[model samples]
Target: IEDPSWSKVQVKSALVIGVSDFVPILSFRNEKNEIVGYDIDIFTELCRRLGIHPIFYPIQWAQKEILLNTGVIDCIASGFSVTEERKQHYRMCTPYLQNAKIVVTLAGRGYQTLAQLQNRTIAVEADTAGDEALLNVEALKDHVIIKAMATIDQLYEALDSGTCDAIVVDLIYSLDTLDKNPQYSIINEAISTEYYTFAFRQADASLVAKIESVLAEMNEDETIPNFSRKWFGSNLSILNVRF
Candidate 1:
């Protein structure tokens, strides 16, 4: 591998990609903290095609956009949602995956929908798309209060301990959460459908083009779906039940 230093020899050189340890996305740790995931693998292939070796940078979700804007990292590939609010802040590539929001409640609660929770508290990951989606629900307004948790695991803990009536989170995340804790179950309804995209600085059209070309190439070869199946099998069920 080439040294991760910026040079003008190639079309794009020494790119730094940020990722989070948000399982099924990107995760790994070296002697120094680093980000690694499925996004990392895809980005590695992109750089291989471009004849460059990218560097790794560990970025937390809250700091992802800041790193991109300050040019600290070339792009964020941490399963970031392409919401309208985020689109206003950064340039986004074509979506790589589609996800939705769902509610997780204790089993036998009979809480079929948000409407059933007239005066309840819902746990959310702070300042995330799931939090925003919950706040946007008209029926949940004023009636459903929010308790923001620090992490996905915390959200489930809060729900299990009865600190909150339910937790709202990304559908896949909710499934993964429930897979670890069968005591809780996710409702088979979605609050919103969101696309996960790679994000870069809004003005970097050249960089965006480079990344998009690689993504398009991957899509045309059906490489992405093949990779997805390796991790997430082609299952079409209401709730992603785990054994």
Candidate 2:
């Protein structure tokens, strides 16, 4: 409430939220042709509590920071991960969701570890946190081929078409994808723990504090739990870890 950034948004009565279109269950276009998902719902409630309207602005994933820096959007809330590099560049709310990157391979392949995927091809959504993780794995680099796809659909297509032997993705999306496809099995629990955070610029510390405390309140009152159950069948959040 004391943030000049928060006050500016309040004056406009709108929070311009930048988001990517393809993060299923986080933010995606539903069959009804409406943009709806867990992140969208979270942001909506955030705006409601702040007395501001949420204007979801679809932005290129790779261009997210640029768009934010240029003032095209107030925040990026599409399940953005909390990385060390990101923390240095942006002010972030405490992580609300806990997740990990995972690897999926054909069921009959019997690949159960990253070591088992040696010399194999794997795919990840380009410019995603998953992609960044896969690219940096010392055990994987030079031992495996990493392909970056532009979308989740492309990751699946590449896997199904034999262009890639495995796919790496966020655990949340992997669960839904696996339920929809039987032939694929997770090869391994991969990557370091990834925590989702909303991103604001460095100058928005008070705004981050405002949203972060309210988010903690949401966790305390079980609002987040209800939404977690609605989407994930149970609580898969780390709100308890912080609050």
Candidate 3:
């Protein structure tokens, strides 16, 4: 193969990252006590195809960009979202999954609308898209009490404990959480829609292009669908807007 953008990097490993506490979405440990999840499996497959190794790293979600810029990690491969602000600062691979910001509350809460939650407390992970989306809504922002948690798991815990009336989190994690705990239900409305992508430092354009090419091939050959089915029980094909 011709030399690629990442050819000059001496290391043959990628630093896959996510908050350590989010289970199913990007958990730090599974039943076997190993770092494993949808994101881990995705990158593992990518590295296998690229003849490279993967190094799993858990860090504060808010510090991902700083860690990447400081050379502490190769790329942010967690459930990272694509946003206009992020695109201005980082080089991102093509989107492979779709996601949305949503509200979750305990079942039988009688909270049927966003307006009904006025003056109620809602939890969100700091620096996440959900947090930004909630802050952007002038109507909701003016009335709801926003509580920022350090991690997604913490947000759920707060909800379960009745510390917050609802939580603004990603739909993927919210659905998984509700599946495992029937007492929770997601609001029928969404805050915002977004796409999931891996992000690299701005200078790693060649690396970004290389990874995008591999992802495109995977999308074409059903590799991503297989993985998605194994985890989500559905073919989350971004090409078809099914995720």
Candidate 4:
């Protein structure tokens, strides 16, 4: 497909996506059976500003990039992490939020440190930054059995069911869940810190640029922070951070 000129680029629709179960913080189905969350709200507002309709698309987390490449989706607007490898393949917008890779285990298990997780089974979302984070840790790499699940909720299920002793997940995604459930414990420190951004095909630089411009404006006017507070009960916007 040919790239559209910036002046003539009018987005009519966007296939927004997320894993089926990343709730509250990202996209997930509500009790009313409607998809909603931070990403959905952000993209809805963005599409509104761009004069387009946003189409919600639930995707297998691992197939995100493949779908983007094939035009099955316009862009990934979920809780997508910005990584060096991803930067090489896709055009991503400015960082909107900061996240950390954290290890969650049963509170009674007492896996208080990274070293304690040695030889234990750890669950992670397939092809996510959490999976990569665990793999990159030299100490954990050779010792732990990494179980990749299709969704964040499944990873938590693995941990709860004793199939996995722990899980590597996005700190933001797990915060509320962990808070409500006293059974879980997050390791004291994060494995790695990363930023979140929406990604699009390299050919869609014009679209990416337009989104970035609007995002910058939102940041300046505290619009992004307001959305953050609405969902997370705290202002987690990275507007002041240099990305």
How large is the C-alpha RMSD of every model relative to the true structure? Answer: 6.4, 1.9, 2.9, 2.3
Worst 10 residues of 3 by lDDT: 12-21
Ranking by lDDT: 2, 4, 3, 1
- The number of the candidate with the highest lDDT is 2
lDDT (tens digit, per residue) of candidate 4 on 50-134: 7766777777767888988887776786678889999888888888888888888999877788888889899887788676798
Write the candidate numbers in order of decreasing TM-score.
2, 4, 3, 1
Q: Model 3, which residues run further than 4 Å from truth?
A: 1-5, 10-23, 239-243
Give me the runs in candidate 1 sitting further than 4 Å from their true place. Answer: 1-12, 25-36, 174-181, 235-243
User: How would you encode candidate 1's per-residue C-alpha lDDT over 42-157 as one tens digit per residue?
Assistant: 78788888888777676676777788778788888766777888878988877777778888889878777668766898998765766678777887877887888767778778
Largest TM-score belongs to which candidate? 2
Between candidates 1 and 3, the TM-score winner: 3
For model 4, the local distance difference test gives: 0.78
The clash numbers for all candidates, in the given order, read 3, 0, 0, 0
Q: What is the TM-score of candidate 3?
A: 0.89
The deviation in Å at residue 34 for candidate 2 is 0.9
TM-score of every model? 0.82, 0.92, 0.89, 0.91
lDDT of each: 0.69, 0.82, 0.75, 0.78
